[PDB]
């Protein structure tokens, strides 16, 4: 059962789903199609939860027979009640400047084995765990990686013995959340999970479910989209609000962002799926958008699909780039904090840039002003010049990261004004 602990030594920063992932967590007996596991294992480590050595051998045989990349397959032996790894597995946070930790909570379901799982996850990953005494579920949580978290109202109503202020304080203490945006769920369904209607695609992008004009939740969802469209994101610009039209409860927001690939559940008709996949492609240049059909025995549902049955795993040796970009009409100095959770040697730290969209991107070394603090000034440009840039860093543990994560295909853009 859940065990409360003191929060992590600060400062704390919750890691977003679109940050670097070292693996993805799935569970057996499966709630996902084998084709999805095969596609995930092609590029990423797939950790499968099984209850015993016998179940591990059964899964190995299924993976082997289906041509799954076994070199990217590992296992955790732990009892579980369900395959909703999104909802009961631990949440990732950076803390004490150079560490990655796991945050446990009271799973809001009568599933004691699922509730106990984060202890096994932290042990497997070789990371510390912290017990946040809140009734929570991963399906109802998303962070932008800049201290904001969006959750439906059950984050308050399922913690009714605490004031909203005490609930907010726990999110701040254990996950570094400074903006706990608890909203009235606009879907009118029993589940009240953010992932059934909303998803941050980047710190400045949010996807909000859209339904036909006649649907009873049409105005609630339009109001939610307008609410995000009118607010300033972590980067100081208004959110880019994208909409995925569900003509018949297709769970298009219930996708998985895993490194440079996005796994979107598709239920049909093909024309409606194609429109939703093209919204992701428009919103996320450089990402591989993959439509995934459901398993006939455990199909995708409006309230429960691909995101619900997966959970990304952060990199405990994460080469992290902290940066607030210079954007739009605009001193033209960028600053970035670059820290290695592996305590690896960081070199080089570069700014890749392009002027007026001409030619290839050019690299310039950033200056290290103080430990882990890098700067670069844009100089010798002309008024009305347009700039594209991104940050690039590598370390001697073989890690290579860009900011934004996808790098060159979606650079930061500003105009010399
Ligand atoms: N992240 C999610 N959408 N989770 C769906 C969980 C569905 C499951 N039947 C429950 O209510 O527990
Ligand atoms: C209360 S309805 C729950 C639906 C599904 N059994 C999950 O859990
Ligand atoms: Cl403690
Ligand atoms: Na738990």
Author numbering: 44 to 373, 377 to 463
What does the paper say about this structure?
Uniquely among microbes to date, P. gingivalis also produces a secreted PAD (called PPAD18), which protects P. gingivalis during acidic cleansing in the mouth through ammonia generated during host and endogenous protein citrullination. PPAD does not require calcium for catalysis and is genetically unrelated with animal PADs and, like the latter and cysteine peptidases, its main catalytic residue is a cysteine (C351 in PPAD20). In contrast, PPAD citrullinates C-terminal arginines like those generated by the prior action of Rgps17, which may be facilitated by the surface co-localization of Rgps and PPAD20.
We further obtained a substrate-mimic complex of DTDP-untreated wt PPAD with dipeptide aspartate-glutamine, and a true substrate complex of DTDP-untreated PPAD–C351A with dipeptide methionine-arginine. The complex structures are equivalent, including the backbone of the bound dipeptides, except for some minimal displacement and the differing side chains, so the substrate complex is taken hereafter as reference except for issues dealing with C351Sγ, for which the substrate-mimic complex will be referred to. Comparison with the substrate-free structure revealed overall coincidence of the complexes except for the rearrangement of the Michaelis loop (maximal displacement 7.5 Å at N230Cα), which adopts a closed conformation that traps the substrate arginine side chain. This causes H196 to be rotated ~100° around its χ1 angle toward bulk solvent and Y233 to be displaced by 4.1 Å and slightly reoriented for its side chain to bind the substrate (see below). The guanidinium group is further tightly bound by D238 through a double salt bridge with arginine Nη1 and Nη2 atoms (2.9 Å and 3.0 Å), by the main-chain carbonyl of T346 (3.2 Å away from atom Nη1), and by D130 through a second double salt bridge with arginine Nε and Nη2 atoms (2.8 Å and 2.9 Å). The aliphatic part of the arginine is bound between the hydrophobic side chains of I234 and W127 (both 3.7 Å apart). The C-terminal carboxylate is linked by a double salt bridge with R152Nη2 (3.0 Å) and Nε (2.8 Å). In addition, one of the carboxylate oxygens is further bound by R154Nη1 (2.9 Å) and the other by Y233Oη (2.8 Å). In addition, these interactions draw an intricate network to fix the substrate in the cleft, which makes it difficult to imagine how a substrate with C-terminal extension to the arginine, i.e. an endodeiminase substrate, would be bound by PPAD, as a C-terminally extended peptide would collide with Y233 and R152 side chains.
